[PDB]
Amino acid sequence: NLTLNFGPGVLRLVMELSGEMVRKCDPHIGLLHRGTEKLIEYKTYLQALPYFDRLDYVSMMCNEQAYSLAVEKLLNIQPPPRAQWIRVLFGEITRLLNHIMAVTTHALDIGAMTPFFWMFEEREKMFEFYERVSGARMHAAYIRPGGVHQDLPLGLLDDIYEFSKNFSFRIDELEEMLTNNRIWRNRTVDIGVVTAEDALNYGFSGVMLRGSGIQWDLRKTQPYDVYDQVEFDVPIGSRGDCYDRYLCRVEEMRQSLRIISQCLNKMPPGEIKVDDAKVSPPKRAEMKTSMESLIHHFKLYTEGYQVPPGATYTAIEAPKGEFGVYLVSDGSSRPYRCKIKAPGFAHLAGLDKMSKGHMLADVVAIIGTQDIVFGEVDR
Amino acid sequence: TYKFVNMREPSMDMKSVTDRAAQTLLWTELVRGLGMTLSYLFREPATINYPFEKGPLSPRFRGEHALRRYPSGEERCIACKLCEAVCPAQAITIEAEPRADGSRRTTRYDIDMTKCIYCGFCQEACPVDAIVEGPNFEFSTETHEELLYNKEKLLNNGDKWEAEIAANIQADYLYR
Amino acid sequence: ASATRVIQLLRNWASGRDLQAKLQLRYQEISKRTQPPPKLPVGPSHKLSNNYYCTRDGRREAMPPSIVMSSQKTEKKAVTPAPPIKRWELSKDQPYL
């Protein structure tokens, strides 16, 4: 029963082995702790928005949406319908990016490594959509607490439709290479089995719940934007192993394609940010021609908007599970407290339970199926 | 509504059992995966020939910063210090004083490119379109010091890129 | 793509699908990089009259949270935080995979 330290995303893992089996596995975190929650207190809400892209850098617009929803709830305002549809459309696109990344990285860690390139081509195309709308490929800062920053370019919906009508073949090729493979099945089936009661008590969320047979989804039970206006199915597992969660992620990719099609078909006209110049900055022409617009632009970009005092906990169904923000405001233009709840924290906490009586090579598979990105874990 | 992903019961008749045994013994799915890889081998790769071919971009792209100026030749910056106040990373340092003719102008305008996060807040907080985030992205450096831009470097960047900077601004200013 | 017929048949047989129907490389079917100017319609609060700000200001409508059972100050049926959720339906589009 020897103890070994797998040292330096990047992770340190101290584990005891009795031969081939794993006795105890303790993960050490803090290698990517930068102190985001403390730096937020020294910035205004708009200045604190970009931190959430760095939070979970595989799913960025989802973090933006969570923070924007929290600030909107505190502000007692709502965005225009077109902004909500853009948020939902982009959120679905981001979910695809996150699921592609997770599945391909898990396969590459196992050793497949071909679907990684096959689907990173599509990830590059998605980066372009992110780039066309906001000028940034990854750290977009597109979604703001008033809606979105800018309207879509005139040729974006057609390109999104053209891209999204050929993605099903990419998913089919991924499933062909992975789903029915006997080596992949032997690597994943009956690995890291977690019961429904343990998954609930251990604070798991997202696929880790849905993989165990629990019928829970925040987009269905507690819709936030335009979700109650789009129809989609929720994949549910039956064994709680890695294979069931992989199948759930693939089916979630397909349902994301479904929601993207619905959002493209049902796009409404109108403005893209709330018509409240005391919260959302006015247009440049209005700023350069109107006195009130100039005053409000000055005050919004220098001091910011004051949020009424109060504490809220806003949670959304991010691609990695329930992503939440507990925001406490004292009435000023700077948040008093911003606690971030990331599903990776609870998942990595339960890793030790989920890796009981498994081989050393099984720990890599379990970590891959947890969908762990340490930016959100460490914050 | 919800779906089941792994709720299929395999058939237990002789034909299905024989088919599964044949799959196990002859490796049909492995051959199918090999055929998929072979089919993917015979199609055109997606690689572009950098640096002779460049990836597509858009007018909204954020790159290396620049300071623009009016057509008459006077710099647009008026030392309002909005970009400094809105910078999330505190990468902008501004010092100003009245000029020889009494115009409100800057004496120091520094951007620390190693602190900047390229969020574009500075170019959208500017009321006179003075500071812009240009479209250049190939400006790597061999030393840390040369990434600490001062007013002269930013003005040189503006004079160098003004053509396509103004073209992009003209193309995109109706969305702002 | 610029592929010969024999290679196309080989790829279609090996993969099992029609590759040329749905290619993964973008061609002239994409939109042009030069577009006409937009117009971007104004929002709902751009009226010239009957648009006083005190009637459409969300922030000042926020109130401090209501207090029930401050310690410093009948059948009585038992209650729940919300009615129990209804059972989900089995997705009558593709119930099983």
């Binding site: 370019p153 919906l157 439709y161 009508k165 099903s168 499933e175 062909e176 394609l257 | - | 117009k39 593709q94």
Partner: peptide
């Protein structure tokens, strides 16, 4: 004067988008 012009789907909407899994059987007993 000029009329409102922004990104909207074309009249009649977009075409059907395939999302169902397509895993065929090559065929041999």
């Amino acid at each position: 004067a000029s009329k409102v012009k922004q990104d909207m789907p074309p009249p009649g909407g977009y075409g059907p988008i395939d999302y169902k899994r397509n895993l065929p059987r090559r065929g041999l007993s």
